[PDB]
Amino acid sequence: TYPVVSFNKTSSPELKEALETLREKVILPTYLPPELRQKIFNKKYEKELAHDPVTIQIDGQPQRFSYINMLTDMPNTPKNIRAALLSMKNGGDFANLSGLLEGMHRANRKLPYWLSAQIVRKACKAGHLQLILNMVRDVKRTGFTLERHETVNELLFWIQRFAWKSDYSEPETRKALREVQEILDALEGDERHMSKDRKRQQALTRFPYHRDPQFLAARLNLTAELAARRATSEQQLNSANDVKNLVKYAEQLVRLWPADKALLDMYTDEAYVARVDLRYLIKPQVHLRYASFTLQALKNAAKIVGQLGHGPLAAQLINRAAAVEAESQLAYAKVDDGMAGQKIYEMVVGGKK
Amino acid sequence: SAAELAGLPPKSKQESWRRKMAEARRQSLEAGLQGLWQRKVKRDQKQAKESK
Amino acid sequence: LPLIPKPTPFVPDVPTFLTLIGRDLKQHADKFPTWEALFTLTTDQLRELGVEPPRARRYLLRWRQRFREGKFGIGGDLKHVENGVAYLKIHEKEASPTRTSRRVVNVPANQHVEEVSEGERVKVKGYKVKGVSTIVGPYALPVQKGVAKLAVTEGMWEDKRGHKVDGGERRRAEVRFKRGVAERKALREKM
Amino acid sequence: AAATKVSRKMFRELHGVVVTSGLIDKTVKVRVGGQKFNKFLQKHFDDPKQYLVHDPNNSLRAGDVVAIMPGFITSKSKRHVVKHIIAPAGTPIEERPPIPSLDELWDAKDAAKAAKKERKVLREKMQAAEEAIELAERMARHAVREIAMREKIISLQK
Amino acid sequence: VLKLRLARFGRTNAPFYNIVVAHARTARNSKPLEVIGTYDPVPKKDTYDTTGKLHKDIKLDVTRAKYWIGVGAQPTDTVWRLLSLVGILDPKYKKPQP
RNA sequence: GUCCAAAUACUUGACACAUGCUAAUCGAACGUUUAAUUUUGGCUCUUAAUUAAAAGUGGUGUACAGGUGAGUAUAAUAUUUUUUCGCUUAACUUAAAGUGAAGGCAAAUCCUUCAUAUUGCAAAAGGAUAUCUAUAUCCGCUUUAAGAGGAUGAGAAAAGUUUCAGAGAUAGGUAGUUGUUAAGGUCAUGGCUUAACAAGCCAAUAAUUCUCUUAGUCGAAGCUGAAAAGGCUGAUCGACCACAUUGGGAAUGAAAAAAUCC
RNA sequence: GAGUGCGUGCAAUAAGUUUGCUUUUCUGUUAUAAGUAAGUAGACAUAUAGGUUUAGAUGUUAUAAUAGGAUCCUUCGUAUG
Ligand SMILES: [K+]
Ligand SMILES: [Mg+2]
Ligand SMILES: [Mg+2]
Ligand SMILES: [Mg+2]
Ligand SMILES: [Mg+2]
Ligand SMILES: [Mg+2]
Ligand SMILES: [Mg+2]
Ligand SMILES: [Mg+2]
Ligand SMILES: [Mg+2]
Ligand SMILES: [Mg+2]
Ligand SMILES: [Mg+2]
Ligand SMILES: [Mg+2]
Ligand SMILES: [Mg+2]
Ligand SMILES: [Mg+2]
């Protein structure tokens, strides 16, 4: 069905070393039938393979497969992925994650739960957001499921940051708001993103990802940045239309989000205990990271909704913002000078720049 | 059925049909066994009566 | 005695009915002068008109009796049809603060789902929402995100007759073998 | 309840003559009478038959008249048992070992069979205990490792 | 699978049936396990009757058919229709009232 | 030799066969491809889907129905009567409990395997349709306890029954074969099984074995006689047996009971 | 002299097949070994981070014993002489 995994673009030589190792011993063997794949890892057939090694009609050229000691010759998949990941400083380099995670999905390699959040961080800080959303869209092949609650909170963060970087320009904001809805529709509709781990995290938070106030607040941010610009008939229709979605989403977030409850109190108190789910939020360095856009959203949202003549919502949204701002200010007094969280929050909410 | 001995209504359309067909087979077996039993008794008496 | 059912919006006239049920029954669309002649004519009368073979006459009488009982095929419960083309749309709701019930309803092409009243929106049977903006169901071609249409096609409601691939279970090896022989001869002749 | 008792049912008695004896232990060939009806000729023909009768105490000599009974299964080809001696041959009846009554022969089967079941229930229980010990012994080596490994982790959380 | 079905007999253009209890996968006219009764499709007319009514003669052993129905016998569509009239089973089909 | 209806119609070469047909079906098991349709991404190519066709993987059925009479010479672990019984994981009725977790193929209700299921061995599979401003049903799957059915175990015990083709030759056959003791096995009985002893058991008028010739067997099923345990036939009807060019064979399955398979 | 759908002996023999001092291989528990691959369990630390490190309780790999099923040879074995 799909083309065989291949890597033909590597800027540094160390990168190629990590990929060629996995490709020839962890990904390529999977393309063999169940019969032959059991011969490579057998000592009884070592003597035979040395004479007539196995071959496959890959792109015409016949491949080769000799004996491979399962205990010694096999490489360490986590380390190799980490080495390959750190050695990525080019567009063509990060384009290999689509093939890398594909082969790992074929090899049934249970990668670290936190790996998804790491790939989204390094790949997005270099300007390769589309290569990520392409994998999330092509989940049937790359296996880049949105399992972790952090991966969803890490991805939505960058989507908002890319738009915020250019002062929320209409051309990109219109495109950025499409990507957010592309995810919220995938978490609900698409079934590839549903797994046992996600069933546990949702049970602790009592909110499904597509109805989690932490994620919905991202959709309310970009929306609030569309009505602020305008509030030419074709363009005037979109502005008036966005005012309906704002009051619609703003009225939905207040319902789910309880009263006077900050980010660390939204979910149940039993979720912040386990480290395999919803514990990154405890560290102030990470809290300020996801508490900046969600905070600025409520402020900018409560403002517009106040101009339209909605008293209740104005007081409601300001209630949450005051609760998150107070909690956010606390974390700002404990974060170490130089950490990413202190810089992001200082640039977004503080507006220093 | 346990759901029938408790006096509960049928779950769906099919459950009601099965309840009726099962009873039709329950009453038919009773009237069949008893009906055929009287035939044998009435037949054995005639033979013994005449043979006597 | 012979009650006649009212024409529905999806099946307004006879040519539409005979087209849906397929089986090449649209030949005799002219035999029936009106809609009331289809459900009135008898077996013997249809035999005099020319409705043959008997398989087509007995098959038409079946879909005839099946129409009186409201046992329509697919897309028969539609109400908002325009020139044999319908339009489906998704109607979202809020069953709970964390769930959403989506139903494939039938509304005019121009009007929006929420704008239509409760009694005007009709839920079509056999069509569901797989996901959040995809309409799944037989003969549901997509028009937009969350919008599909139903075009009146031939054989839409027909009961497909079985066929044999290459003579069935008994005479199958014999058919394939001869076909192969002809191909090889042609290739040798061509070379 | 668990012991199966013989039928202890009485059957017909036949008068015959011991044709052979002393060839096989506790067995004699007795010749009894019969009559088979021919349906074509409408005539009865003598149809004598010779069976292998069970002699428990070897108290029968070839030539004496005896009374046998069927339904006493003792071997593959033996289905008759001696009831009593009609007319002895050679020596009087009082100079031969007594013929056990059918009750004595039936009781031997019940007792012999009952004791057989006693060995089964005993050998069965021993086989179960001899196997449950080997099965529970694995739990010891398997539980000691788990308890020794599970206690190591718990002790590191205090 | 025990079935209560009709074994067709008679001559050309003169059908006469035989209600029987036979195995499903067996010839239609093979010797069955039992013969519950007979059935004549062509309706008759009373001898000295000019009203125009018609009736159908059906001989059936109800007591024997009930036992077989109670042990899992599956009557065909036609035999089921007859048993419904007798009151042993419920109608499988009904005329739509609407 | 005018007409009508019903019923019969290769009795011979089981000789050779042109052509069309006699077993297929389920999309509410499953994905694969090709078409348009609508969405992505990057500037025709490339994602993710919907829909319809066309070949397939799976489940059940081709173990029923229908045809023929070549071969086939019989007393057999065959058959009724009464007493006592046993087995049955498919399908059909009644009900209960359980229907979770991975891997392999493109995918699966297909293969492989795990957890759980009185004590310990021993199972399963999912698919589909509604309701509300997740819940409840539907068609299946696994196991267990019964009824029914059964082609079932060598069932057994007692007393009976079975007109076994024609012609010729053959006096030995039987080796766990016959019995005893002990033990196992079995619902129970039986060298059924094993160990150690004993030399027995069946038959003598052919038990046993062999050659030749001929034949599907049977029924008030057909014909016939006043009648005989009548005679003859063995078409149409029903039951049984065998075979599917000839010869030699195995597996699957609850069960070979196939026009299958080698 | 010609023929033979018969019986039978020997040789030979495809499918199939008894047996095991035949040859390979898979699976199952049982007892060990390893923890470098896969995993599965922790213990510490880091922060545009997610590293270091030990561990075998299920499980993976290896050896041995043992049970079983597939392959090769063997035996029997149509045609054929
Ligand atoms: K013939
Ligand atoms: Mg005399
Ligand atoms: Mg057949
Ligand atoms: Mg015949
Ligand atoms: Mg399940
Ligand atoms: Mg008697
Ligand atoms: Mg023997
Ligand atoms: Mg013949
Ligand atoms: Mg014959
Ligand atoms: Mg030889
Ligand atoms: Mg040889
Ligand atoms: Mg390791
Ligand atoms: Mg040798
Ligand atoms: Mg030969």
Swiss-Prot record, chain A:
Functional note: Component of the mitochondrial ribosome (mitoribosome), a dedicated translation machinery responsible for the synthesis of mitochondrial genome-encoded proteins, including at least some of the essential transmembrane subunits of the mitochondrial respiratory chain. The mitoribosomes are attached to the mitochondrial inner membrane and translation products are cotranslationally integrated into the membrane.
Broad class of where this protein is predominantly found: mitochondrion
Entry protein name: Small ribosomal subunit protein mS27
Recorded GO CC terms: mitochondrion
UniProt keyword Calcium, yes or no: no
Subcellular compartments: Mitochondrion
Subunit structure: Component of the mitochondrial small ribosomal subunit (mt-SSU). Mature N.crassa 74S mitochondrial ribosomes consist of a small (37S) and a large (54S) subunit. The 37S small subunit contains a 16S ribosomal RNA (16S mt-rRNA) and 32 different proteins. The 54S large subunit contains a 23S rRNA (23S mt-rRNA) and 42 different proteins.
Protein family according to the UniProt entry: Belongs to the mitochondrion-specific ribosomal protein mS27 family.
Keywords noted in UniProt: Mitochondrion
Curated annotation (Swiss-Prot), chain B:
Residues of the full protein shown: 107 to 158 of 316
Protein's name according to its UniProt entry: Small ribosomal subunit protein mS26
Subunit record text: Component of the mitochondrial small ribosomal subunit (mt-SSU). Mature N.crassa 74S mitochondrial ribosomes consist of a small (37S) and a large (54S) subunit. The 37S small subunit contains a 16S ribosomal RNA (16S mt-rRNA) and 32 different proteins. The 54S large subunit contains a 23S rRNA (23S mt-rRNA) and 42 different proteins.
Superkingdom as given in the UniProt entry: Eukaryota
Primary gene name: pet123
Location relative to the cell: Mitochondrion
Record-stated family: Belongs to the mitochondrion-specific ribosomal protein mS26 family.
General function of this protein: Component of the mitochondrial ribosome (mitoribosome), a dedicated translation machinery responsible for the synthesis of mitochondrial genome-encoded proteins, including at least some of the essential transmembrane subunits of the mitochondrial respiratory chain. The mitoribosomes are attached to the mitochondrial inner membrane and translation products are cotranslationally integrated into the membrane.
